[PDB]
Structure 1
């Protein structure tokens, strides 16, 4: 579901743009990861969990 912009007065004179981020915008491979890589932007350990 790209961001097709119309840019020209003719066919296929267009630009495709994509965008993503949310709470789970930390490290990623295809998905973020489980215990890491999203909750490093949603949960962010230091509740007691560095001592």
Structure 2
């Protein structure tokens, strides 16, 4: 779903846009790796694991 824009009054004169963040987005291994690299942002391992 490329969030293109249209610019030229003629054809093909477009732009490409990239928007990817989410609260489940953190350290970019590839994706939400596991409990880490996305979900310390979400789940926050500092409960008692961090003790």
Pair in the same fold by TM > 0.5:
yes
* TM-score after normalising by structure 1: 0.81
User: How much has 1:26 moved relative to structure 2?
Assistant: 0.5
Gaps of 5+ in 2: none
1:25–1:41 Cα contact (<8 Å) kept: yes
Gaps of 5+ in 1: none
**Distance change (3 Å), C-alpha of 1:31 and 1:15:** same
Moved runs in structure 1, 4+ residues, more than 4 A?
none
Structure number with the higher helix fraction is: 2
CA RMSD, 1 decimal: 1.2
